[model samples]
Target: QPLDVVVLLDNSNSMNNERANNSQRALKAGEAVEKLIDKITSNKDNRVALVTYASTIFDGTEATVSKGVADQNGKALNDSVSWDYHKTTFTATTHNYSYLNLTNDANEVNILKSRIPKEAEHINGDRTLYQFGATFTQKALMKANEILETQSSNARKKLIFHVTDGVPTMSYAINFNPYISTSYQNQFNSFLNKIPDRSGILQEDFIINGDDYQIVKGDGESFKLFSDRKVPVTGGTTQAAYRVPQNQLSVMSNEGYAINSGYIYLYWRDYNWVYPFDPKTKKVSATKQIKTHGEPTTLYFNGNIRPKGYDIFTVGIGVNGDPGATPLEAEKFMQSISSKTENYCNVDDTNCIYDELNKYF
Candidate 1:
């Protein structure tokens, strides 16, 4: 089974400038991705795709078949050959790349490699860099999903390579502002919602912060963005009624259990959430099954066990973060992705991506 690889490049102006040694950083990311692909796949069933963005052109450019097909349908679908943007860097003032340029199948991937500028292999003084912070991030992912959709049952494991220092920011300044209702945002969310929540043979981690009301962490235990609605808690609360039975927690420990915490603010809208104490307050919170990000509230983390033939390697990426807090928040983010395989409770049978990252590099 071959794996489908999507290497999304960031080509924003700031990234193009090579400031703060970003050029080397970008090349390192590319190298990391290439190494990751080689390590993850043993057989030749793996297929890779490239999605790079730059705002220099009339529309954000996409590497595809027809040279003029910039706006053409470039959806990836179990193909071999990919695209190449001309070796041009730092052309104009504007910078953005989010469009897709689908290509036909080919036996060799060597041709597509030319499209990506190697770190040491430079054409001139200027090195080819992918655009950063564009609307294409989600769209590129959506294209990956499309390619995976057309794969056979015997396909290799699917992994995404999103190597970007900055967050996803779209071109068309208007499109950057998410508050504005647009079909693109809705479509992107829909694709994300479809990512099966069930991780194979892994336990899901339910994170609850005592101080913050709403904890909105990216990439999660559940698909629902808002953790169970804001349950009003007036200060001190305990494992009286909301928490699962202690005995049950022990039973599920082997299967996979939840971890709880206190006095940390999870940011969402404006307010922070806290645990509940009074029965009246608890009742109001319990009544709502689907909680909204309103008024910040505490949550009793409980969910159905993985039915037979279900597994989840729940990795808490950015959990328990606080500047002045006891356990350093910054370190927690690094540890969540860098800890030992045996040490992680939810992460399943594989070396931590961050831990083995050097191997890939």
Candidate 2:
């Protein structure tokens, strides 16, 4: 079967640091690409693409970058697949090979090496020619998934080689607020007082009719509270009761308003409550927590690549090379991104990198 490969390179500022003689990381990356090209050129059905990613920026006055590069507001670019040669279909007889012309020949290895960016150059005030800002790992992986989706149907084995030097600064924007209610506090307290005691109240049961009526809870079920009344003085008399909507009452007697009234409020706040509220201001605000490269992006990467049966290989280069770096986090992040534990590698030198690339290619 044909193999479709994407080489993901981290083109961030730290990658171009003076510590490695400026171009050490980039050159090593190019060497890896050369090896990859050499390994795949013999197969007529194999195709490879290169993608690089860095932090994207936008000025308030502009709609888009001059080159039509667009990124989400307060977010990274979705289309971060920076560069790739035109897709070439290798044939048994075709021999042409050059950086300008992608063809099926052993010389294509050098062409692929030449195409890899070797220097970090500034292009405009807001952008870099090659290396830029923070590592947008998830965004770049998503872009690679998109590119692979557009390739030939016969390409059966899809592989991704993701290389990076540091922990990914990119994070997934996750909102924690699930339930929004205005009358929960009042209704919950009222319901608590009406219940005489929690004797027969099951965990998921609801109280109604001033503790006289109980409703069993079911999945996605809702209930209302009512008052007991008899015939009026002349004919019948009725007791006053209120029909509260299901949303007003807590799903469980112990969970919502009941817990909100006691010292257990802190417990519920930490566990059941999705958003945070100010005790002084009595104002509830939406809560959002940003999760970085580890679980957040790995979950995203796995969800996209697993079902399609794609082979994923993750490479961590210069894990200890970043300034004030946490090598453990970088190593863990790359481990989380790979499909198998054996499919991941941590390398600091050029030879190890070449070996890892060859092992996977």
Candidate 3:
């Protein structure tokens, strides 16, 4: 039976962490796919779509992306997995790689390859979106899904081959001060409105997950909300831990975003309120209030992909000494996401990268 495959290469900067034969990890990742494409095409019934992803930038002030190599433009989160996202969402980085969709053409493949970072030095410019640190694994998966969505009925299986050396870290830093810009005040109010009154699936249920971020009156002297979970606090005291940033730090919502539930990244700064926050207006409390505080560091998100009968194969490149986390943590992540226990491989032995890909096909 012919296979419908999506080759997702993690082009984030970490892929450049190590090199083999003077080829960086990302360059090596491309080469591995080039070989995979060569072999899979032998069955020729197989069609391969290539997708490379990094940080997704937004265009709003304070909605700018973090964990990125260069703060190019604001990147709105393409955070949803619905058909409506394209019409309703916008990002600073856009890939109109319509030609790369379900394509077997070598020409289009080369274009995807060229976009990957190859130089030994850091090239964080617009030429390559590959050097950023935001390992948007979710976006990469969404991309693979979009490519495979239109496969012919004759297609036997929808396969996703995802390769990455890091975790998913997408966040935006916002400032909300009524004393400052009125626009900032509006941003804060508008931000809180995004959250639903109750926590649930597909809603920004930060209250339960992100209780570390605080919510308080604008006076800065009244009572402060705090959390009891004690996930980890940098401020030494968990003063405002009770509050959940009314706004989602990543702007993620919907079942797509819920696939891999994420935790808030705590800033732990003094006297500053973070987004993913909410507060009472003076009309209600006669006093203004503000708040502040606190990944996909779990297997649940990857777990969501398999029940759909999607064959997911994961490879970890030079990850035994994983850059994003502990050596074993990286291996565990790749292994867990795979459709089967053995559908995973971690290559500190750089030469085996291509060999690893060959095992599945």
Candidate 4:
């Protein structure tokens, strides 16, 4: 059977960092992706959709106003693509390119190459990146599923090639630029003691200090924004604070799963969310969510219908990160996400990956 595959690549900061001089694991992953595209399309009956993700989206600027390595929607510096303008060095917006929804044409494959970084230095410039931070594998899967579910793709075999150096990591707070959302931001900042840069970008590292509370961004399918939430910082507090729902999912959520350090996801939206909703508080205006034990991605993969129906091949690169998991822990993460034992590989050997995937094709 011909295949319909979604390629999920991690272009987050860690993938962007230099593992060696002028060489980024992300660019290697990019090269691997192009090769995968070639291999999958060899049957011609196969179709490919490429989706890239990262926690941080772009550099703040006018240059990207139309195009600085576009996002899933094809515009850079667009709120649809960003959260906090944390890193100043990430000026070029090749952050996450999920834009190439699904395609079969050879030319679009060439275009897909354009989104890959020309050099390892292309992302960080002369600056440094400490960690890979958060990239939504959840949304990557969501987008991939959404694409594969397209009526025209119904007849093909479904597959997903999800690549990441590490799993999803979320902590700290992010304030959307006033340009993105003007009305409630200052209230949010004052409440959290977060000060936005002159560009109206509120930035921080994985652990936030000062205010015990921080604001959390929703994937839209979940909740809108959760605020007054306390972090687990040394002097901080981990408590419930609430706010807007981007849609009905927020109002509908009864709980959320806690992932990473103290970050969480809404429960009713249910892809193993990480937070708990205020059972008593339910209204159109706001919903308060607290912490809960979130489901592990490995279990989510092996036991769930989401990936079980589709062939999932995972690619792993890097030794330690999210600055949390050990090298082996990270390896197990990629392994667990794969559909079967034979479907995962060490990304250091593209030839091995190609050979392993070669069997299925």
Candidate 5:
């Protein structure tokens, strides 16, 4: 099935303003993102939907336009598996793409190519219906549940592209802190509330048969709130040690398993270590290491736990050969998760964000 993308644009005033005045243009982050969508959907058989929230907009924050679902094997849906996911129930085929064109489908490959914006100016700007301090992300997500409640079962990969510049600041009902803006906080809480709290077959559960297995977690219902398991890899160089365990003979596989592998990037910054790379070799060195003052690096890395199956990838950033305190400790902490082709940029960047969007949309 094609990736199902739901974009939540934070229309709070801060999003419209530039980081600082002396540098570049203060373009709206949402605006920059519309271009990203166009660029992404251009060549893939992806579906696009837009949701914006500020303070007043509530009921109609949802809008969806599909590239449409066709046959699973380059033929029409009727000729392929008759799967569907257009409703709220836990149907086995709800996420099946047997009737929809997948990323590898030839005909669906260039279907979105012509949809790219000629120039950045071509991107559309939609007004949001909420106040700045009144931003409610959790409410917005509930709204997503309502809107997607009737979606077809053929929806393959469902994704929510939540674009925000800072941490959540709003609450569901009301905030006592009159001094700070509650807009973003409310939205963030609303998004979290939208996730269904349950577990079952359709609820995304899988088991892997391996001697040395570890759990990884990402955002959403699959998020492992707490757990304790340690999988160790050699440290000291600057390369990412795959948190996903490897057998003495083979690499782990994600097939049929709902493996999540992005949270490792989320926790690398807390460690006080240095990213290692050989300038002469132009390759990652195994001697790379990550360390923390009082805690075990492995525990920090494995803090996140998914109920079933998930994989995490850490592309460490930061590189300096100065050595001593900063190089030996603080530097590796950040670089350990920010320096990879698939994990380098922020959650919104095209490389990591869009790639995942295209994959599951």
Candidate 6:
């Protein structure tokens, strides 16, 4: 069966990082493409299309179909050809050749070589410079899928070679906040002092000044009756003063002091108070604010492509350009993007990349 393959290259700034040494990573990619073309042309049933994506599609600027015949739909025909911004770097020549013609025709190989973008061309001008923004991995995949859709129906197996280095910078909305609300104070009250017995008058024994004293109300007057007092007048005496026991006197004095002092002053002295709400659970402290941009759009788009019978092959390069410098999260993200566990390639060494690509092709 014939095969339709789209080589989706990441032309992001990271590919030309200092660690990559003058766009060596991009150079290696071009070499890999040439190798793949050689292998595919051997089996003429296969068709290959080169699609590179960066900040925008097909270089930083819009692509123009230069010398290709258009179909009734005004789209470039399979045999059409396109070029770089200045017709100096890469050129894409779309060809629809039969199994016999592509294999037997020697000129077809030369045509493929001319269209293949050279490593020097990619490294020469501003192509190696960073886009100064996020890498739109999802958008690049969508563009690659669009290109593959235009292939002839005879092409049975469709494969996408998605190459990238870092995590996605742009996507859906994300909300994140770490601040939590906690209890500032706990509810409490001061101690109660006076209590009435069976008598109509209010009576209570308390300590004040290391002496025991009984508080009694009689003849609309309040008096402190003590056991040691020599003058003991009963019978509704308006004026009565009795010496009180030391313990009783102390208790009465402490109670009076507590009543005069506010509870907030005494209890909160140590600042050990909590709010009514549970302190274990943290609520929203202030206005809810988003910390950073949300999740990647890769998952959504990859899901869309997989169901359509497209095998997704993801290649993660580095922390920018150095593979060892690649973050664990970015590596895992690329793994998740692949259709299968083995379908993903996380490479730091240029040689390892070629090995992985050889296996895939």
For every model shown, what is its TM-score relative to the native structure? 0.35, 0.51, 0.52, 0.53, 0.33, 0.46
Model 6, span 1-361: residue lDDT tens: 6666676666544455443545465555556666656776577666666566543345334322122222222222122133321221123321211111122244655554455443222234543222222344555666667666654442477777776664553322211212323222110110011112111111111111221011101100001111221222346534323233454556534434222222111111100111122224523223322111112243334334555566677766544423222366566666666667676775445564565456435
Which 10 consecutive positions of candidate 1 have the poorest summed lDDT? Answer: 293-302
How many residue pairs clash (N, CA or C atoms closer than 3 angstroms) in each of the candidate models, in the order given? 31, 7, 25, 10, 71, 22
- Which 10-residue window of candidate 5 scores lowest in summed lDDT? 88-97
lDDT per residue for candidate 3 within 175-233, as digits (tens), equals: 33444334544544554454342111121312213211121111111112222222234
Per-residue lDDT of 184-285 in model 5, one digit per residue for the tens?
334334433433432111111111122100111111111011121121233533422223334411222322211245212111110011212222442322
Error of 2 at 52 (Å): 1.7
Candidate 4 lDDT over 1-361, as tens digits, reads: 6777788777755565565343467767777787777888787667777777654332221111111111112112211123322221232333435445567787776676566552333333542222223444543554566667762355667888877775554322322222332334353334334322221122231122442112322221211123322222235554321222355234323333222232232122111123332223421112223221111233223323243367788887664644444566666656666776656787876675777676667
**TM-score winner between candidates 1 and 2:** 2
Whole-model Cα lDDT of every candidate shown, in order: 0.29, 0.43, 0.43, 0.46, 0.28, 0.40
Instruction: Kindly state the number of residue pairs that clash in model 6.
Output: 22
CA-only RMSD, every prediction = 20.6, 22.1, 15.3, 16.2, 24.6, 34.1
Higher-scoring candidate on TM-score, 3 or 6: 3
TM-score of structure candidate 2: 0.51
The segments of candidate 2 whose C-alpha lies over 4 angstroms from its true place after superposition are 19-23, 56-112, 121-131, 175-291, 321-325, 348-361
Better of 3 and 4 by TM-score: 4
Clashing pairs in 2: 229-239, 230-237, 230-238, 231-236, 231-237, 232-236, 232-237
Off by over 4 Å in 5: 18-28, 43-45, 56-133, 173-350, 354-361
